[PDB]
Amino acid sequence: LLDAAPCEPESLEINKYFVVIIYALVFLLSLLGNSLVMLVILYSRVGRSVTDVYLLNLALADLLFALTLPIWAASKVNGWIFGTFLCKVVSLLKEVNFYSGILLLACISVDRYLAIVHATRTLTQKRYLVKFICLSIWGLSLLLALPVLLFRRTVYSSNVSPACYEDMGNNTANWRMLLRILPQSFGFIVPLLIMLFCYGFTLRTLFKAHMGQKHRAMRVIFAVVLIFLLCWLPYNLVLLADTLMRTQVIQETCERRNHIDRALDATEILGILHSCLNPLIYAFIGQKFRHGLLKILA
Amino acid sequence: ASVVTELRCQCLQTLQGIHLKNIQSVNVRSPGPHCAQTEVIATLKNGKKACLNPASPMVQKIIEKIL
Amino acid sequence: GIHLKNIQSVNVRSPGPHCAQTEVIATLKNGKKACLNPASPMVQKIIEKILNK
C-alpha cells in the first residue's frame, strides 16, 4: 500500500498578490464609512434615539476590526513574523470586535421587533435600556474572547511558515475543535435564529397594514437578512465541513484538504466585507443620517 | 514559503517495512498543535517520502540504527 | 544539553556526499534550530521518550 505518503502543501502567487489589494480596499472603505457614521451621530445631540446608540457601537466595532485588518493582511502575505505578544493582542481585538458586531446586529433586530410588532403594547418601553444592553454585549464579547488570549502563540513548522495558532498542549487539535463551537453558536446560530424570528414577525405585521412606506421597509429588511447570510454563512459552512472532516465523518484526502483550505481563505475574505458594508445597509439607507451628513457639510 | 490557515497531520495512513538501504533521512515530530499523534516521516534516496507508525518497534529500531 | 520541554521536533540526517557525519537537528518551540551530538546517549533517550509519547 505504498500509495500512502505526505500530502505536500501548495501555495500560489496570484492569491497572495490579489488578497493584499482586496484587504487594503476594504480597509479604506470601512474606515471612511465608520468615520462618516460616527461623525454624523456625534456632531448633533438632537434626536439621539436608541438606534443612534446601537449604530454608534456597531460603527466603533467595525472601526476597530478594520484597524486590525492590515496586520492580518501582512500575516496572510508572509506569515506571522511579528512575535507572540502581537499575536495575542491582535487576535483578542479581532475576535472581540467580531462577536460584538454580531451581537449588536442581533440587538438591533430585537429593537426593531419590539418597536414594530409590539408598538401598541406596554413591552416596548423596555427599548430604552440601550446603555446597559450595550455594556452587557461588550462584556459578553470580552468574556467569549478569552480562549484566544489564553491559548494563542506562534507555531514554527517545516512545511509551513509561522502562524499565530493555538497551543493547548498534547491534545490541542481536539480542544481547538471543541472551542470552535463558540464562534458557530454564539456567533452564527443564536443570532441567526433571533434575527429570523424578529424579522419574520416584523414582516408579518407590516404586510397586513396600509402604511405608505411599508414596501421600502420590507425590502430593507430582506436586504439586511440576505446580506448577513451571504456574508457569514459560507465561512460557517466551510468551518463545519472542516470539523466533520477532522472527525472522519467525511472522507479525508489531500485534494479535499487543499480545497477546504482555499475555501476557508476565500470565505474569510468574503466575510470581511461585513465591516465595510454595515454603514451602508444599516445607517446610510436612512433618511435621517443622510440629511445630517448633508447638513454637516456646512 | 507557504501560508496555511490551519495545521494538519502530515500523514494519513501508516506504512511499515521500509528498507534502510533506501532511506536517506528521518524526521520525528512529537504531538503538538499540529496533530494529536507522533509522526515519523522518512525521506528516501530517490526523493520519495513515506510515513511510519510510531508504535512499530521496527520503526524505532531503524531510527536508532540511523543514529 | 537541551531540555526536553523545549524540543518541538528532531530531524536525523544520515551521512551523504554533502556531509560525511550524521547530523541531529532539533527544532525548538521558539523556532531556533540547534545541532546535537549524535554520540550523546541523551539524544537517543529524548527520541525514545518522544516516540513513547
Dist CA A90 CA A149 (whole Å): 9
CATH dotted code for A13-296:
1.20.1070.10
C-alpha cell at B56: 512499530
Dist CA A113 CA A274 (whole Å): 22
Residue B34, class by beta-carbon neighbours within 10 Å (0-12 exposed, 13-18 middle, 19+ buried)?
Answer: buried
Q: Any alpha helices (H) in chain B, and if so which ranges? A: 57-66
- Residue A156 has φ and ψ, to the nearest 5°, of -95, 125
- Strand (E) or helix (H) holding C12: strand C7-13
Q: Using a CB-CB distance cutoff of 8 angstroms, which residues of chain C are in contact with residue A162?
A: 31
> Cα dihedral angle (A62, A196, A289, A279), rounded to 10 degrees?
30
Residues of A with CB under 8 A from a CB of B: 1-7, 9-11, 16, 75-79, 155, 157-161, 163, 165-168, 170-174, 176, 242, 252-254, 257, 261, 264-265, 268
Dist CA A55 CA A63 (whole Å): 12
Q: Inform me whether the C-beta atom of residue C53 falls under 8 Å from chain B C-beta atoms.
A: yes
Q: Using a CB-CB distance cutoff of 8 angstroms, which residues of chain A are in contact with residue C30?
A: 156
Dist CA B24 CA A93 (whole Å): 46
Residues of A with CB under 8 A from a CB of C: 154, 156, 158, 162, 170
Q: Inform me whether the C-beta atom of residue C7 falls under 8 Å from chain B C-beta atoms.
A: yes
Cα A106 to Cα A100, A113, A253, A272, C50, distances in angstroms: 10, 11, 38, 18, 49
Beta-carbon-side half-sphere exposure of residue A115 (alpha carbons within 13 Å): 11
CB B26 within 8 A of CB B61: no
Secondary structure percentages of chain C, helix, strand, coil, to 5: 30, 35, 35
CB A252 within 8 A of CB A245: yes
Distance of CA A25 to the CA centre of its chain: 18
The helix/strand/coil state of B60 is helix
CB B58 within 8 A of CB A15: no
Whether residues B15 and A4 touch (CB distance < 8 A) is answered with yes
Residue B65, class by beta-carbon neighbours within 10 Å (0-12 exposed, 13-18 middle, 19+ buried)?
Answer: exposed
- Residue A51 has φ and ψ, to the nearest 5°, of -60, -30
CB atoms within 10 A of CB C42: 12
Give me the residue from B2, B12, B50 closest to A161, CB to CB: B2
List of long-range contacts for A42-48, beta carbons under 8 Å, 24+ apart: A43/A292, A43/A296, A44/A292, A44/A295, A44/A296, A47/A288
Q: Inform me whether the C-beta atom of residue C44 falls under 8 Å from chain B C-beta atoms.
A: yes
Whether residues C8 and B29 touch (CB distance < 8 A) is answered with yes
Give me the residue from B7, B31, B41 closest to A157, CB to CB: B7
Q: Using a CB-CB distance cutoff of 8 angstroms, which residues of chain B are in contact with residue A6?
A: 10-11, 41, 49, 51
Q: Using a CB-CB distance cutoff of 8 angstroms, which residues of chain A are in contact with residue B5?
A: 163, 261, 264-265, 268
Residue A165, class by beta-carbon neighbours within 10 Å (0-12 exposed, 13-18 middle, 19+ buried)?
Answer: buried
**B25, β-bridge pairs:** B43, C13
Q: Using a CB-CB distance cutoff of 8 angstroms, which residues of chain C are in contact with residue B64?
A: 44, 47
Q: Which of B45, C26, B7, B41 is nearest to A160 (CA)?
A: B7
Domains of chain B, each with CATH number or no CATH: 1-67 (2.40.50.40)
C-alpha cell at C11: 530531524
Shortest CA distance from C53: residue in chain A: A170
> Cα dihedral angle (A83, A84, A90, A95), rounded to 10 degrees?
140
